[PDB]
Design an enzyme around this catalytic site. Structure first.
Site, mmCIF file in Angstrom:
data_model
loop_
_atom_site.group_PDB
_atom_site.id
_atom_site.type_symbol
_atom_site.label_atom_id
_atom_site.label_comp_id
_atom_site.label_asym_id
_atom_site.label_seq_id
_atom_site.Cartn_x
_atom_site.Cartn_y
_atom_site.Cartn_z
ATOM 1 N N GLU A 27 -1.206 -2.249 10.928
ATOM 2 C CA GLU A 27 -1.334 -0.938 11.547
ATOM 3 C C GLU A 27 -0.038 -0.502 12.224
ATOM 4 O OE1 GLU A 27 -4.304 -0.069 14.672
ATOM 5 O OE2 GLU A 27 -4.511 1.794 13.485
ATOM 6 N N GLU A 28 0.501 -1.390 13.013
ATOM 7 C CA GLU A 28 1.621 -1.008 13.850
ATOM 8 C C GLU A 28 2.848 -0.683 13.022
ATOM 9 O OE1 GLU A 28 -0.311 -3.821 14.550
ATOM 10 O OE2 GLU A 28 -1.084 -3.421 16.597
ATOM 11 N N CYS A 67 -8.546 -9.386 8.605
ATOM 12 C CA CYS A 67 -8.316 -10.802 8.443
ATOM 13 C C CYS A 67 -7.146 -11.104 9.390
ATOM 14 C CB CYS A 67 -8.122 -11.121 6.944
ATOM 15 S SG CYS A 67 -9.626 -10.538 5.914
ATOM 16 N N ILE A 116 0.828 -1.203 0.000
ATOM 17 C CA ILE A 116 0.000 0.000 0.000
ATOM 18 C C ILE A 116 0.868 1.260 0.000
ATOM 19 C CG2 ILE A 116 -1.613 1.291 1.522
ATOM 20 C CD1 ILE A 116 -2.998 -1.354 2.250
ATOM 21 N N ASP A 118 -5.585 1.889 6.648
ATOM 22 C CA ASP A 118 -4.933 1.343 7.843
ATOM 23 C C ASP A 118 -5.922 0.411 8.550
ATOM 24 O OD1 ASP A 118 -3.631 1.070 10.404
ATOM 25 O OD2 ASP A 118 -4.812 2.783 11.066
#
Length: 499
Positions: free
Chosen positions: A296-297, A413, A267, A278
């Site tokens: 995310e992290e 997921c 991305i 995100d």
């Protein structure tokens, strides 16, 4: 085949696709913490107002430099004065830094474990790198932290639940704030009034013996190194967005939009200038400064200005998302979770818009967590994910010609247990309704790429609308799920439409 569908070259991106921004100006739904009349390319923004103004209440961030941030002496002292005193010491051993942070956090002297900090400094870094850390990086960070009242002079409103509100601030202001987060100076955020807010102070980053802690630390110190050496010159906007009305999906007559699907690329790299999803925790940032090192992290670590969203963003309700425009990428990495490593510093080449924000727009949308797999096919659950995504993608008062494609992937997921094939379709429908094309990264799953392509092309050729597809989803629930599974979703949809 490495990708399928519409060539990615034909998808819209910023800044090319964008209309000119209105003049940047503060208003009741927009906080602007810099002098807009003095904003110029290549110049560090000037804070507005000139002198520090303090608010200490339940509507604004509680600043460590507040006259109201007090500590026990039994007499009452200025904790900010204590913080200055504690951090202005020479560090030559990790214990000195732990001791300094605990001087103004005395109640956490047993609770806060600093093992990962000590281990990074002592058992990971070589002598020379350790020296650069305590002679140069940490002292520069302290100094930027302690400049806070001169840098962040305007009170910062909490982006509380139900608010539709934006905060636009300079990268330099963010760096001073994050430096404070590192030294754990934010009052009242440890243990309560902020139970509906993420943690901001970095104390959990220093705990335990996870092998990924060194890689987190290297990622963060790369940032700190760069922003304390040469102040970044741009702005970042944080927007909390709530929608009041959601579509009647069953009746939505909108056609499907275009799709590029690929099992290679990322991305952040291949999704330049697109709306980048995100996969958020409802507490934005998730485990970024504790344990947690998935999508995310990772993004919050390579673009640390995202982290400061945790200072002021209340947990997201079902109808909300957070939109952040202008964060800069400072690091490159490899791997994922337990294989994640910091590789090198990244020189972000993104163009900046007319507000001096990098042309990088990231939206945080949190998927539901499904205890049982079949739970997600329940219509209330499907509708919720549709509306969540729609909220993340919709830009009221912008025409589709000026909307970049959405760059996304396997949202929700993994640990949260979403079915990728269902989530793909849901994002496709939401993006169709918001009148955006979709660029979908399967992250190595070649089979998933072909399946998503084949379904999308199947439905596009048959001219099925958002409504037509949603109705198939409900049919799947009613016929295959509630009396249980037997037949998978996509096979069901193929056979159902073929007749």
């Amino acid at each position: 085949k490495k990708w399928l569908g519409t060539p990615i070259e034909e998808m819209r991106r910023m800044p090319r696709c964008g209309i000119r921004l209105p003049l940047l100006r503060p208003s009741a739904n927009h906080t602007v913490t810099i002098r807009v009349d003095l904003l110029r390319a290549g110049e560090v923004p000037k804070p507005f107002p000139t002198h520090y103004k303090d608010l200490w209440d339940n509507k604004h961030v509680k600043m460590p430099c507040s006259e109201q941030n007090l500590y026990p002496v039994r007499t009452a002292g200025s904790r900010w004065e204590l913080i200055q005193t504690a951090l202005l010491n020479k560090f030559t051993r990790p214990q000195n830094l732990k001791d300094a942070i605990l001087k103004y956090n005395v109640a956490y002297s047993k609770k806060w474990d600093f093992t990962a900090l000590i281990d990074f400094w002592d058992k990971v870094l070589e002598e020379a790198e350790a020296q650069h850390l305590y002679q140069s990086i940490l002292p520069d960070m302290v100094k930027i932290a302690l400049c806070l009242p001169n840098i962040c002079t305007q009170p910062i409103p909490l982006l509380a639940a139900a608010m539709n509100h934006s905060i636009t601030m300079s990268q330099e202001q963010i760096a001073s704030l994050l430096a404070n987060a590192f030294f754990c100076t934010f009052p009242r955020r440890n243990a309560s009034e902020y139970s509906s807010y993420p943690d901001i102070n970095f104390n959990r980053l220093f705990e335990g013996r996870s092998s990924r802690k060194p890689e987190k630390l290297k990622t963060l110190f790369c940032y700190f190194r760069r922003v304390t050496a040469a102040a970044p010159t741009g702005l970042v906007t944080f927007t909390r967005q709530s929608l009041e009305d959601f579509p009647e999906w069953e009746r939505c007559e909108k056609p499907l939009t275009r799709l590029h699907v690929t099992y290679e690329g990322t991305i952040e790299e291949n999704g330049q200038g697109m709306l980048q999803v995100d996969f958020a925790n409802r507490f934005v940032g998730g485990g970024v400064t504790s344990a947690g090192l998935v999508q995310e992290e990772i993004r919050f670590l390579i673009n640390p200005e995202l982290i400061i969203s945790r200072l002021f963003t209340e947990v997201l309700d079902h109808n909300e998302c957070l939109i952040i425009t202008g964060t800069e990428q400072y690091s490159e990495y490899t791997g994922y979770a337990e294989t994640y490593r910091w590789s090198r510093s990244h020189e972000d080449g993104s163009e900046r818009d007319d507000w001096q924000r990098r042309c990088t727009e990231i939206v945080a949308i949190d998927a539901l967590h499904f205890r049982r797999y079949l739970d997600q096919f329940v219509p209330e659950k499907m509708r919720r994910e549709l509306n969540k995504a729609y909220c993340g993608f919709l830009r009221p008062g912008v025409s589709s010609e000026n909307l970049s494609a959405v760059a996304t992937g396997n949202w929700g997921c993994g640990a949260f247990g979403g079915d990728a094939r269902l989530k793909a379709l849901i994002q496709i429908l939401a993006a169709a309704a918001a009148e955006r094309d979709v660029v979908y990264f399967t992250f190595g799953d070649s089979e998933l790429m072909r399946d998503i392509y084949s379904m999308h092309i199947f439905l596009t050729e048959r001219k099925l609308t958002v409504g037509d597809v949603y109705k198939l989803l409900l049919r799947y629930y009613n016929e295959e799920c509630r009396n249980c599974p037997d037949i998978k979703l996509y096979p069901f949809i193929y056979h159902a439409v073929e007749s």
